[PDB]
Amino acid sequence: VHLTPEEKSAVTALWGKVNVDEVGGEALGRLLVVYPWTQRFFESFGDLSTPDAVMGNPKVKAHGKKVLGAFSDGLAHLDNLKGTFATLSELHCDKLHVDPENFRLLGNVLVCVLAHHFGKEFTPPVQAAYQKVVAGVANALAHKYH
Amino acid sequence: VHLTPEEKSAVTALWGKVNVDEVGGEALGRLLVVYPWTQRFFESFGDLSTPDAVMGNPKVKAHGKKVLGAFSDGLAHLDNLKGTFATLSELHCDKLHVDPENFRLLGNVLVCVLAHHFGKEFTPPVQAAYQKVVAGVANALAHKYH
Amino acid sequence: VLSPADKTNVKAAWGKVGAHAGEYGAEALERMFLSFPTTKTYFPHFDLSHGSAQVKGHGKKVADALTNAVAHVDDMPNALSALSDLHAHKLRVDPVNFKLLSHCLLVTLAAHLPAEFTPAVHASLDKFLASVSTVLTSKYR
Amino acid sequence: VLSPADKTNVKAAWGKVGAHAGEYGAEALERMFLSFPTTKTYFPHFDLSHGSAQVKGHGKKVADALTNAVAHVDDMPNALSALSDLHAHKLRVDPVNFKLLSHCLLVTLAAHLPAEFTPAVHASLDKFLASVSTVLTSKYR
Numbered sequence A, B: 001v002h003l004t005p006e007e008k009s010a011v012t013a014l015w016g017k018v019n020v021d022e023v024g025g026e027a028l029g030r031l032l033v034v035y036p037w038t039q040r041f042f043e044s045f046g047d048l049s050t051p052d053a054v055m056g057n058p059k060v061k062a063h064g065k066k067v068l069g070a071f072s073d074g075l076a077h078l079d080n081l082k083g084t085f086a087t088l089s090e091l092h093c094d095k096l097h098v099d100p101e102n103f104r105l106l107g108n109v110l111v112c113v114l115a116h117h118f119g120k121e122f123t124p125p126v127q128a129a130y131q132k133v134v135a136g137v138a139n140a141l142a143h144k145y146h
Numbered sequence C, D: 001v002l003s004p005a006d007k008t009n010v011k012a013a014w015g016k017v018g019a020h021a022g023e024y025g026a027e028a029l030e031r032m033f034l035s036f037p038t039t040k041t042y043f044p045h046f047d048l049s050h051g052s053a054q055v056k057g058h059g060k061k062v063a064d065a066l067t068n069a070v071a072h073v074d075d076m077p078n079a080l081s082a083l084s085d086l087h088a089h090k091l092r093v094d095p096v097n098f099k100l101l102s103h104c105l106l107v108t109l110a111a112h113l114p115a116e117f118t119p120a121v122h123a124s125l126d127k128f129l130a131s132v133s134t135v136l137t138s139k140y141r
């Protein structure tokens, strides 16, 4: 990815204000509710039949925090997403078989959740920088597929 | 892109038999016919109103040859795809404003054209290697978009 | 499909948008132009600057059409036919762009209507926007 | 949107596949497995190897469903309803996978029916497959 210092700063500042408990579960839960085929990969988390089941599932909430933790690392190594995410890419490709299109979907859901959580502070320019970040993470995660 | 040794060889063997005057025109032409919105980018090329109009169009054919030339280049530099397509990437993003999803579509049409030409010779493992190549080219072209 | 639960969700969220519909359409367009610069080519003669009166005005037209789509939920292919014609035949808009705008509209709604943008409403809204997008790209098949 | 000239190109083309329909189906599957390895996860219980008989048998089923679809182009959602339930509710097949299978079917057709796979036919085929795909994933929209 190619971010200017201004984008870098804006991205970094907002991120330091994120409540991971609240954002992580919302992000993951919304992915499972919105794009229901994704539930196939999380069968071991239990019951995910309805929105209320999903959003109230403690495993979904816990895992969501982990996911956010991985985003934190990429934000801390913006010039080397490919290296930062190599292990996770392996996990996702080889062991889980997740199609890379879903990395993009999750990134987009994360963007809606940030807007939901931050309201007006999630301005158009800040969203534009976040779009670059999510694109980069998605690409980095798709690395072992090629 | 990561090709095995058998794959690099298979790719090379086939490319050698490709008719450079025809294949590029065929691929570009089919892209315009199958995915009509792509015509927007070639509006001043003449009559694109029917499949025969597009396919036999002298300008499409001529342009297809350059496109194929670029693929040849990528094939010869699998290990430096980003470096190889750097200016083309900028050109497609900054000047032409082509959405990168279209690079994926073109690569796939190209795969159908290779199959059409080589029949049975275009086996399943050969197609797989070509799929890795085209996906790599599409990615390299999308580099300057983020 | 757009199940009656979905229809209800759409109607309620849209009703809450109410009078700010045009402002929301304008914001979603500005979000799209900045996030996905490739979409700007479709508006050559427009002042795309932030706060531009033209973006505001166009935003209002978009909002109106969505208002209309919500009102004709069950018969969208008919209620939007002219629009499909415009977008697919005349303008030749790349289908991918409808996804981009749908995403941007969702982001806008989430930023302005936090209490209402629940997971279930989000799902309903995504399905609705996908439907609208399918109708507007129907001439490509 | 399956459009009069589209069937006929479809119908004719499916026509020449005829008695080969099943073997082409199996080839498409094998093509998909090798090119898009993520797809093999849906078939834990199969021998995904080349020549595989289970794949041969599956190919036949796939091809038979397509034949029925062609024979019912105008009433595809009723004709494929069961399959839609199976694919979306039971198996949760990722929608993307339908595009991959469709692509691999085209590749199979081009390789076996050079003379028939003209640009016009390619385009009709693509829309046909996309419409089959939409029906099959209708349960998520």
Ligand code: HEM
Pocket: A038, A041, A042, A044, A066, A067, A070, A071, A088, A091, A092, A096, A098, A102, A103, A104, A106, A107, A137, A138, A141
């Ligand atoms: C692109 C953004 C993504 C990020 C940053 C991410 C990150 C992670 C992380 C950090 C873990 C834990 C790994 C470990 O414990 O070693 C994980 C596990 C997992 N992820 Fe993702 N992931 C992403 C996308 C997805 C998507 C889109 C899916 C499926 C649709 C998925 C499915 C899973 C599954 C099934 C596991 C294992 C859970 C378990 O069985 O405990 N991931 N991911």
Ligand code: HEM
Pocket: B038, B041, B042, B066, B067, B070, B071, B088, B092, B096, B098, B102, B103, B106, B107, B137, B138, B141
């Ligand atoms: C693998 C994908 C592609 C490759 C390798 C490729 C390659 C090229 C090359 C080599 C040129 C000419 C550069 C030069 O000689 O100046 C070019 C120009 C062009 N490309 Fe592509 N391209 C690809 C995809 C596409 C797509 C998908 C579209 C649009 C649907 C597109 C639209 C154009 C246009 C509009 C021009 C310039 C046309 C003009 O001469 O007026 N390209 N491309």
Ligand code: HEM
Pocket: C039, C042, C043, C061, C062, C065, C066, C083, C086, C087, C091, C093, C097, C098, C101, C132, C133, C136
């Ligand atoms: C929700 C999807 C959309 C809706 C409801 C919508 C609605 C409309 C409406 C109501 C108009 C004005 C019709 C008239 O005044 O005759 C319009 C025009 C236009 N739209 Fe859209 N549109 C959508 C998606 C898009 C997308 C994704 C693009 C391109 C990225 C786009 C590009 C345009 C253009 C270029 C025009 C003509 C503006 C001009 O030249 O003045 N539209 N649209």
Ligand code: HEM
Pocket: D039, D042, D043, D045, D061, D062, D065, D066, D083, D086, D087, D091, D093, D097, D098, D101, D102, D132, D133, D136
């Ligand atoms: C052109 C689109 C498709 C058609 C016409 C099709 C058709 C069929 C048919 C006729 C069956 C057999 C059901 C039965 O025997 O009751 C089946 C089962 C199945 N399909 Fe598909 N299918 C399509 C796409 C896909 C895709 C893209 C995948 C996954 C990558 C997939 C995975 C499966 C699986 C796992 C089953 C069950 C296999 C078994 O019996 O164990 N299908 N499909």
